[PDB]
Design a protein around this ligand. Structure first.
Ligand SMILES: [Cu+2]
Ligand SMILES: [Cu+2]
Ligand SMILES: [Cu+2]
Ligand SMILES: [Cu+2]
Ligand SMILES: [O-]
Length: 476
């Protein structure tokens, strides 16, 4: 049997009333020939790509047809707290909420997903994620590959595991609270190892790591390079050639890759040094999708220059905020123990050389920032509006991977886990690696967020969010 074609999310623009309609609902999908209940936006699984233009306002009407509450957060969008769709942005089951997004940031690939309090991991695992394609005047002048689903394609990479009956096997338990929910089956826009037919020339891939907990590292099967043109928050100043591209949970990169006649190749993910993530089949390079060259010329360009990246400002005088991540030691130890007991030594491959005691010992509030498991009723601080701040985020105290994400902003990384950032990570980012060390970012918030619709700052390993590793903050 041939590989299925790569599914392409619909690219959705506004109607005459200036509205985009998103319906959140349950349906069925098929994986390895077996039906599973899944959730999607405007469909059974995943979601569309919402197209936004800088300087234009759109209204999004969001219909929750689930039987449980949800929220809809626009990861990477610089919007006021009131429309941010964090855990306070509740959409009742069977209800509708509308938001007006006044887009004011550069071209970028962002995404959207639920932020339901304590249930974000489950709701993403069940299928809910969509994309956001922001354009501006600058990017169109570059003449990059631009034919959606032909030479400009989104690639949403996610793992799942399934029970014997075919259903998605999600659990938030002591093991997954520590190390995350991860699986043995890799999906690419919902499909298992699809093919994508691409014209000769440049192919633009908009890569999203949509896994709950699994870090990825993209490369090609024949070692042809990837030319990174954009990070979370938009274009780099010029392309950065890489042989491999690590991507943390919730991160996006756009790359160009060459397509040549008669030479199919795979996009793959290489084994990562993260606990639990190198269990077979992920102990070896794992195909993500096959690129099948078509002998028709593609028109897109890889320009020498992409955008202007402003200089980092002087750091003296700027407010320095400390955010100390932590995990309860006992529940960290217990989750790791359960991982080791289940999978053995392979659960640490590639790393460096039972009674009820009450609510005090509950893993549901075991993970914390500044000594506090997330309290939706108490923002931890008020950040300045329109002012650069230096946020220092420490994971010293444990060795888990914490891709740290801050709502309401695109920031510049100053130190990523104790080193200056790689060139392709030195531009606009909404995520920074924290793993047993300290990161520092330069952040600015252009929009207000009140106590009642506060911004969040959190680890993007979803099971850590749901077990407390998040804080709220206000702006303005
Ligand atoms: Cu996110
Ligand atoms: Cu976000
Ligand atoms: Cu974490
Ligand atoms: Cu978030
Ligand atoms: O998020």
């Amino acid at each position: 049997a041939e590989r299925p074609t790569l599914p392409i999310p619909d690219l959705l623009t506004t109607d005459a009333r200036n509205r985009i309609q998103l319906t959140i609902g349950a349906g069925q999908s098929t994986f390895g020939g077996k039906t599973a209940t899944t959730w999607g936006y405007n469909g059974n699984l995943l979601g569309p790509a919402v197209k936004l233009q800088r300087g234009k306002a759109v209204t999004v009407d969001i219909y929750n047809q689930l039987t449980e509450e949800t929220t809809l957060h626009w990861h990477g969008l610089e919007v006021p707290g009131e429309v941010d769709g964090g855990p306070q942005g509740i959409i009742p089951p069977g209800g509708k909420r509308s938001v007006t997004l006044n887009v004011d940031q550069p071209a970028a690939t962002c995404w959207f997903h639920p932020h339901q309090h304590g249930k974000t991991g489950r709701q993403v695992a069940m299928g809910l994620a969509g994309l956001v394609v922001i354009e501006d005047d600058e990017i169109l002048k570059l003449m990059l590959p631009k034919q959606w689903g032909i030479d400009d394609v989104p690639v949403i990479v996610q793992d799942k595991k399934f029970s014997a009956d075919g259903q998605i096997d999600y659990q938030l338990d002591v093991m997954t609270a520590a190390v995350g929910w991860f699986g043995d089956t890799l999906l690419t826009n919902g499909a298992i190892y699809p093919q994508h037919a691409a014209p000769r020339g440049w192919l633009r891939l908009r890569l999203l790591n949509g896994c709950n907990a699994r870090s990825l590292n993209f490369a090609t099967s024949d070692n042809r390079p990837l030319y990174v043109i954009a990070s979370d928050g938009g274009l780099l100043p010029e392309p950065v050639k890489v042989s491999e591209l690590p991507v943390l949970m919730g991160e996006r990169f756009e790359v160009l890759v060459e397509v040549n006649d008669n030479k199919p190749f795979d996009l793959v993910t290489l084994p990562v040094s993260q606990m639990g993530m190198a269990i077979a089949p992920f102990d070896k390079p794992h195909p993500v999708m096959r690129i099948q060259p078509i002998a028709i010329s593609a028109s897109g360009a890889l320009p020498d220059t992409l955008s202007s990246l402003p200089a980092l400002p002087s750091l003296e005088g700027l407010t320095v905020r400390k955010l100390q991540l932590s995990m309860d030691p006992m529940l960290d130890m217990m989750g790791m123990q359960m991982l080791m007991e289940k999978y053995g030594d392979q659960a640490m491959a590639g790393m460096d050389h039972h009674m009820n005691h009450g609510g005090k010992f509950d893993f549901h509030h075991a993970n914390k920032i500044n000594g506090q498991a997330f309290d939706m009723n108490k923002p931890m601080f008020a950040a300045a509006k329109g002012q650069y701040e230096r946020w220092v985020i420490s994971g010293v105290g444990d060795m888990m991977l914490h891709p740290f994400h801050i709502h309401g902003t695109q920031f510049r990384i100053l130190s990523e886990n104790g080193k200056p950032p790689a060139a392709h990570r030195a531009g606009w980012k909404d995520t920074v690696k924290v793993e047993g060390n300290v990161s520092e970012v330069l952040v600015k918030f252009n929009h207000d967020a009140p106590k009642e619709h506060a911004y969040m700052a959190h680890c993007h390993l979803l099971e850590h969010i749901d077990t407390g590793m998040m804080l709220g903050f206000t702006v303005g």
